[PDB]
């Protein structure tokens, strides 16, 4: 009886597809690309007949990846045509790089031909399943809210006990805090409020009560206590607000052009030299 | 072989606000156990005794399936299971009509699968922020044990043998399961999970200066879920309960070393700089500011590694608190956020092997070496500066 048990079992199951062609079709669809057995209607999958419950469940488990790929693709295509905050496109570009890396990994798997059965494909990509899953969950409300919300959320997540979440959150957080570092530099070196779109805690006030409170008796720059992210101590926030107001007060009326400009260039160099530390004690020292 | 004309379709899930961070977002497959499709065959047609090998061959397929957490053709889910329920229990019927060789040993493996499911769900349930970091870091570990030890060994090896070996035997199935000793490891994780659930249910059940001159008071409050001190206590208790299994000891030691890396970083950093950074509120004590002159400190007894009932553990805890406060005031007075290493002779290291340090006979040695460092620098501060 030196015969093969799966050979003893396969012709018993007469009306099913050779598992080799199942692999053939799953490799195409893994990137949510329609073909003979699975025509994505851009929103779901129709799994046909002659497919045992086992195969159906495994196709659920695997095709999670393709569904995520399509959803994230819709997100990316939907926002690349819009006018939004720069941190938003920071998220867009990072998600796009993730999508490209997933593409490369999947097609490299297909090329090298280490796929032999469904469960092999399962184990090969389960990590990338989780990566795509986390990337999806982090941007559930990209359309409505502002970026600094995401800055705070990601700052909280930086200490997540998961190593994978550690790495992902740290990368996203690093990129946006570099851009936000640019915002802080702009405020501390020129005192402007350009192109912040409400993601910055120091606001400008164009108001009609006291029409002359931008002429003589007031300076229309306002510190909103509740809008400071948790990685900045409150007292240093007061310091920063007073620094900007100081610069405005000197430039607009005091006319300390030479002193303010030399001071500005010196400190401009001083912060721009330390951008690779982000937010840290050295920056607080300056 | 038949067709039941069932609209089996795959699509992501609509709701997002109740499924945890790592929770799966795909719809559940269509419920063969009550909505059958494409075959309902009773092996009584082929229940002939000579067909026994043939029968188990079919059986083999289904069993090689369930271990990945997906039910097999000749296995029905019990009426209790509901996929939309995240907390539904796990139980499911297999037909007694076949030879016992089908049913007897299978119960062992399906339990694996049962626990394989719960761990996975635990792998998700503990992903939430409020559960603190330790279990959260622990989450990572459980995932690895599946995708690098359970699957890459068992699934790969079992499928290869079932496709190549002439009439691979279920007896050899057991032999290769235990020859890689995975079952015992998985059982250790299982029982640790059961104790964690026990502590959670206990906390969900019952909701209701003299000598040392420390300006301190207790803050005894209970939270619904256990934290790091509880977890570490638990691992110590389990390793104590299973002294002797060398593989078990080594596995648990690796676990303890792996989970508390940055926890040890936090403790060491506090003992050598008096700086406490616990964005999850898991550390042993916590500060005020819920001006910074009456820096009153409180004990959250619920996370301490010891009952703190006798004199010696109280002594250890109080030396801990004093050492932290001393270094803190040093930093406050000298207007420097960091203590340079070379300020003194007594040099200290990190807890590179927390496993043995937890046992005793070295914990206090580390504690009082740091105490000596604190005293010498502090006294030099108020005697020379």
Author numbering:
A (entry chain C): 163 to 448
B (entry chain D): 1 to 208, 225 to 306, 318 to 412
Copy out sentences from the published article reporting this entry, exactly as the authors wrote them:
Microtubule (MT) nucleation is regulated by the γ-tubulin ring complex (γTuRC), conserved from yeast to humans. Spc110p, a distant pericentrin homologue, recruits this complex to the nuclear face of the spindle pole body (SPB), while Spc72p recruits it to the cytoplasmic face. In yeast, the CM1 motif is required for seven identical γTuSCs to helically assemble into a γTuRC at the SPB.
To better resolve fundamental questions about the molecular basis for γTuRC assembly and activation, we determined the cryo-EM structure of unassembled γTuSC, without Spc110p or filament formation, from images of frozen-hydrated single particles. At the concentration of ~1 µM used in data collection, micrographs and 2D classes show a mixture of γTuSC monomers and dimers, with a small number of larger oligomers. We were able to obtain a structure of the γTuSC monomer at ~3.7 Å, and of a γTuSC dimer at ~4.5 Å resolution. In order to assess the changes that occur during assembly of monomeric γTuSCs into the γTuRC and the subsequent closure, we aligned the N-terminal two helical bundles of Spc97p and Spc98p (residues Spc97p52-276 and Spc98p178-342). During the transition from monomer to assembled open state (as seen in γTuRCWT), the γ-tubulins move in the same overall direction, approximately orthogonal to the plane of the Spc97p/Spc98p contact interface. The center of mass of the γ-tubulins shifts ~13.8 Å and ~15.6 Å when bound to Spc97p and Spc98p, respectively, as a result of twisting the helical bundles in Spc97p and Spc98p.
